[PDB]
Amino acid sequence: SSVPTVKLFIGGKFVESKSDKWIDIHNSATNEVIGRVPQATKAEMDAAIASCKRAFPAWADTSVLSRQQVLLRYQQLIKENLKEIAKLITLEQGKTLADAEGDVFRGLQVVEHACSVTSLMMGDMDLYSYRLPLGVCAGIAPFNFPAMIPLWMFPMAMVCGNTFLMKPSERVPGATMLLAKLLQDSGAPDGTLNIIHGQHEAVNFICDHPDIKAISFVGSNKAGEYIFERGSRHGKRVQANMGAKNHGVVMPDANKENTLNQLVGAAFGAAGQRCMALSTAVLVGEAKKWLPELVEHAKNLRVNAGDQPGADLGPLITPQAKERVCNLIDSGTKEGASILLDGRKIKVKGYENGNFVGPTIISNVKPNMTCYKEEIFGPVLVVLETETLDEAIQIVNNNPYGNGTAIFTTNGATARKYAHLVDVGQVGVNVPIPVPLPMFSYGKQGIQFYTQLKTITSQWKEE
Amino acid sequence: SSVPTVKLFIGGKFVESKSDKWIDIHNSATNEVIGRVPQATKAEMDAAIASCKRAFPAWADTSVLSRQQVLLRYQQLIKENLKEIAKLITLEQGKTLADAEGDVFRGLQVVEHACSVTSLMMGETMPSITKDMDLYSYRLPLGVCAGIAPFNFPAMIPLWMFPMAMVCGNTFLMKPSERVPGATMLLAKLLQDSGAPDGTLNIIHGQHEAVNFICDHPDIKAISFVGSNKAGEYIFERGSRHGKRVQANMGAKNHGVVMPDANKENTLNQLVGAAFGAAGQRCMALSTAVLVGEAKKWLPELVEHAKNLRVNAGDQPGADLGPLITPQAKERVCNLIDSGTKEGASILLDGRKIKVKGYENGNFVGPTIISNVKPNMTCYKEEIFGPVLVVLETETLDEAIQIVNNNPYGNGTAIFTTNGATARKYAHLVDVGQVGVNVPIPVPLPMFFYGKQGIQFYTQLKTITSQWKE
């Protein structure tokens, strides 16, 4: 009758929430409610913070080797229960089983990397370089890679000696809850990790509470800047990889078939619901003639539920995103954007009630049009036209923000020129996704962030 | 005389400043005008930025080995021109010859350290991560950089700041202090003599308007500043607004703690040398001290030692502390001492009425020791920036640690004791990164700037993923 509720995580126990506000988790494949996520109340969040504070000293006093072994056990458990995580992802977010498994494998690789770190966490002029932890940390997850967000923050935040208070995606909490259950089963001390669900109000609380020494967030630029400002206001550490559009340049000498295939796979893969999604492209020179074949390749994609075989792309997380992308495409058409493929009114047999949206391609887009300004975060690929490499480079640089940029070409001179003159953190050559996840502002940067330094100097020979 | 002006340095020529607004440089020992520093106009700053941008590409494409050679020749010239820089510093800033010598010595040491960033500038690569797929990262300069130094350390701070941006491949626009630009001009001349490509370094002089320009201009990528807390916070906020990365040392407050189980004579000597050292004008000055236990009964010995300090001009011998930076600084120090006295703090030692024979016109202020200070008093909250020592009375180490923690912009302190457990307790409880043990100043080298961290700051990473399959 009543769908199950999403439990919290305080003091090493999945306690139930007393809040009255509940959000229904609608299955993106059929819009069927499959869960209920509550909004953490003030008392619940205060108890979570108290548990994190009480666990901080004990967890920190332990040696780096104990935390390393705990994280190794957690990684082993994840590897054992990878199929469960994949099924939970395909159920909640509707992502394909293959893409979910790949995401879980990437998260496991990130965890392993976090484990491979050496004793670096420790670090008459007797001097020391003790790098002590910060304290109670927190994190906010977007709707792109919810199951993987905790796998980025928990390993480093813990091995560094800090307690974490996670804010998972209220619309995809199952994956994070399963990951936390596995972590607890790994043998970690009770109270080391805590989890609370909520909305913008919860983000405000987290950014306002003083005990929160650091916070990490990824997603839209608006929320990113908002969290950055509200955190810097309270004088606490903040780091966020702002989501941005990626521009995939295509030279005429590049491999036409392979380039088109990779573009159609990256842009429309998982309905473009990736922060590294290649939502934009630039056809240089004769590449303009590839629009018909690009549309054909896009059509060749097989739309189907994430749990069914042969599913190349899944539906949108929520119907609100479908309405948003529809309105964006309508505005683009009104402004004069020449659309070539329209998958908005797609009716997937057996799942018409879902948020499925077929591949969409748009050409003749200009930098001043809303299509180039607003982030689609959907199965839409806006195509631009240029006459020379310099034009494409300038167009890509004009973008206010960008995480990754790809250029398909076989000439080494052109590739090097593009990679050197471009102002993007990550540059890919013949690869639409330079890195599976945004590394540009973690690894070394994460170690430097989640820790501090005390240069204890002493000249104590006389006494 | 005509009070020779401080000409600018744009491109490969020391172009004269056409600005109408000028500031007269006064000698702190006699308050006599010795020079006129210009207030760079919009056109001059635009020309300097254009020169920096035009020089950037050639300096970046140049091999790092050539930049290291240039820095080596510059350090050699500094070694040769040590005495000249020391004399210019003693003249303008008013410090003692020994102070300027040590300043240039630390600058040269940091330059030498930076000269060995060759291995650090090298990138990394992983061959064949996937079939016919490779990965490699390139470290590249940020672009054009800027520097804003305080009235203290006109040679050490630039020598710590700009050479890193140079070796990293960036162009630097140094904004020297409004009060002591001569040393910076001499350093720039020496650098130009080192064979550095013209246009790589540019210097402009001006008031807060210059800082506003440097922070507002978009071409500027990174900005560095050292000095007071207010100016540092303002510059950091403006850079964050305009997107400029700013690294600033604003926690200039420093506290000293002395336990009864410590070397009395040596601790007192070190405190007297650090607090009143160079008239206590340096940012990282130990102008605050917390006396615990028998330190209260030792305070008389501290005053006796402070009385031994000979207030005399730097040019003359026996100079332990020189005159203040400006007469307004002396007025402010006197006002702060008077406020502390009115607030009930006993002035165990007074130096306001000091009169150096032959240099009364200067801004000389003798050692001042203030006791009975409390957290609610102004002398504790306000930064003195002078030869004044505020002494707060506490009973246990916990009280001193709490007093230190009450000052968040206090990233610097030291503890004097003999027990290792006490030192560990002080290091842990105190929320300060630079914690010293039986040392007056905890490694004057400040940071949020230099070393490998400096390279990371003045450089960026570009992850390149290339798969030349076919």
UniProtKB/Swiss-Prot annotation, chain A:
Main location, first listed in the record: mitochondrion
Phosphoserine PTM sites in chain numbering: 220, 338
SUPFAM superfamilies the UniProt entry points to: ALDH-like
Swiss-Prot/TrEMBL keywords: Acetylation, Disease variant, Mitochondrion, NAD, Oxidoreductase, Phosphoprotein, Transit peptide
Record: active site: 275 (nucleophile)
Residues that bear N6-acetyllysine: 13, 18, 21, 42, 53, 83, 95, 256, 288-289, 322, 334, 444
The organism's place on the tree of life at top rank: Eukaryota
Reactions that this protein is recorded to catalyse: 3-oxopropanoate + NAD(+) + CoA + H2O = hydrogencarbonate + acetyl-CoA + NADH + H(+); 2-methyl-3-oxopropanoate + NAD(+) + CoA + H2O = propanoyl-CoA + hydrogencarbonate + NADH + H(+); (R)-2-methyl-3-oxopropanoate + NAD(+) + CoA + H2O = propanoyl-CoA + hydrogencarbonate + NADH + H(+); (S)-2-methyl-3-oxopropanoate + NAD(+) + CoA + H2O = propanoyl-CoA + hydrogencarbonate + NADH + H(+)
InterPro entries given in the database record: Ald_DH/histidinol_DH (IPR016161), Ald_DH_C (IPR016163), Ald_DH_CS_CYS (IPR016160), Ald_DH_N (IPR016162), Aldehyde_DH_dom (IPR015590), MeMal-semiAld_DH (IPR010061)
One of the GO biological process terms: thymine catabolic process
Modified residues (N6-succinyllysine): 13, 18, 21, 42, 83, 95, 322, 334, 349, 461
GO cellular component: mitochondrial matrix; mitochondrion; nucleoplasm
Keyword Ribonucleoprotein: no
Compartments where located: Mitochondrion
EC numbers on record: 1.2.1.27
Gene3D superfamilies to which the protein is assigned, alphabetical: Aldehyde Dehydrogenase, Chain A, domain 1, Aldehyde Dehydrogenase, Chain A, domain 2
Residues given in the record as NAD(+) binding sites: 141, 143, 167, 170-171, 220, 375
GO molecular function, a single term: RNA binding
Functional description taken from the UniProt entry: Malonate and methylmalonate semialdehyde dehydrogenase involved in the catabolism of valine, thymine, and compounds catabolized by way of beta-alanine, including uracil and cytidine.
NCBIfam families: MMSDH
Family recorded in the similarity comment: Belongs to the aldehyde dehydrogenase family.
Quaternary data: Homotetramer.
Implicated disorder: Methylmalonate semialdehyde dehydrogenase deficiency: A metabolic disorder characterized by elevated beta-alanine, 3-hydroxypropionic acid, and both isomers of 3-amino and 3-hydroxyisobutyric acids in urine organic acids.
Protein name per the record: Methylmalonate-semialdehyde/malonate-semialdehyde dehydrogenase [acylating], mitochondrial
Gene source species: Homo sapiens
Top-level taxonomy: Eukaryota, Metazoa, Chordata, Craniata, Vertebrata
